[model samples]
Target: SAFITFEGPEGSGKTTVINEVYHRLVKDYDVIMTREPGGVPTGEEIRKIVLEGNDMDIRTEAMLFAASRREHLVLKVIPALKEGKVVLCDRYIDSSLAYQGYARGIGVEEVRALNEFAINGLYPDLTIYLNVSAEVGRERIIKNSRLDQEDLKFHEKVIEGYQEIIHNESQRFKSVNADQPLENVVEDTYQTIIKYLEKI
Candidate 1:
């Protein structure tokens, strides 16, 4: 099965690209497009508990995300992969590694180690890394959206966190220039993913 995931911080155009890719892939292959910590019904419940409030400890948040991820794997993802279906997940272990671990100062490596045991070593076949500048990405969000309330510093930290992951595991992560026209991003992502699909 050709399992794939798109990963990046908020305001990085991840949703737009994932929707585009999902519609394209479902025509030719059996695909399940999803997101982290909230894809399945139980995972959605976990997402509410983990991300809704502002009172949870940082570690508590990370652990909750892991719980949801565990459920997502056992109940939905692994089953589809077992049936030889390609799963296009929106986020995965990398979210916790970057968001809760690196950005939140919880330590990415340690979180990753714990997550390794949680999922029993299932990882994406490829990751589309949208490398958008924090300022530009945040500007777009602030101008049109209300979901992202992070200041420049936080968004920048998340960008750095993604950089750390890429530097450490360059093979699995394909960094794409996201400070581009929408057409350019979509076209480039399509090409890279197509190449990766051919390999699979």
Candidate 2:
């Protein structure tokens, strides 16, 4: 069993690609596909509080996400893994460390440290990063979806944020070209995970 995570900035097509990968890969094993700040029921509640409500402090939002992650860990992620299931969570501490931390100017190291305390050193066995360029990524967001509709510069900052992370954690990060067409990305990601699954 392995703990895998998918990460990318808003509208980078990661949400769609990760799902495609999971749906295809699930046939081979008992796989659980999920995301933060929601996976389990309790985590779902925390997710709403953090993302929906605007009154909460930045630290509070991060804490809520951490709490939700812990709850999901207990109820969803852990149980699935114990039953010999492969877990593919859509987003994890990376969101806080990048989205809220670097992009939001809260600081990546700060979010990382807070997450370290919350998760107690539990981290992903592997992370597949859907890499996308600034122009294409924003174009995808604006043309495709209504979620997290920030402008180009912010999205670039998020990518820069990811660059910082990938720089230091090269061993764990597998950055894939998200600029490719849908079918190619799906095949590429599926192969990536399949290679790891075989290793396990």
Candidate 3:
């Protein structure tokens, strides 16, 4: 059993890659794929408000995300982990640190404390970071939604945030070059997960 999370800037194709990996992993492993901010019913409600709510304070946004995360973890993620399943999470605490903390100017350390309290010391066993340049990520984006509408500068800060976090916790992270074809990214991600799973 393992808890693995996928982290990336917008348009890094994280959702697509995670789906592909989940399908492939399920063939030979007891794996379940879920996402943050909306994995459970209550979390979904929080996700709707956080993503669609207007003119919200940055602190409120951070708290909402942490709340949703706490619900998702307790209701869904921890259950799967307890059943000895490989939990493939689309995003986790790192997203909050990157988006709400570093990019939105909430302060990474501050957000980290909030998330640490939410998870109560449960962290992913491995975090797969899909690395892509801001320009490449921007070009790949097809959604015109709220978060997707953020400018290149914001995206760049997000990337920087991930880099700093990864550097600080290098052993917990495995980076994959994501500015490539979908198949390549999927293959790299699959292999990376397989390699880690083999050890455990």
Candidate with maximal TM-score: 3
- Candidate 1 local accuracy as lDDT? 0.82
- lDDT by residue (25-131, candidate 2, tens digit) is 87887787877645467888877776688677888887887788788777777777788888998888787788778888888989888888877877888888888
Candidate 1 displacement at residue 84 in angstroms: 2.1
User: Which ten contiguous residues of candidate 1 have the minimum total lDDT?
Assistant: 143-152
Can you give the TM-score per candidate against the true fold? 0.91, 0.91, 0.92
- The runs of at least 3 residues in candidate 2 whose Cα sits more than 4 Å from the true structure, single-residue gaps closed, are 146-150
Task: State residue 81's C-alpha deviation in candidate 1, in Å.
Answer: 1.1
Clashing pairs in 3: none
| Per-residue lDDT of model 1, residues 1-200, tens digit only | 87788888777888888888778877888887877654588889888887687788988888888888899888888888899987888888888899888999999988998789878878888889988988768866776654335567778888899889888887778888888876777778878888888887
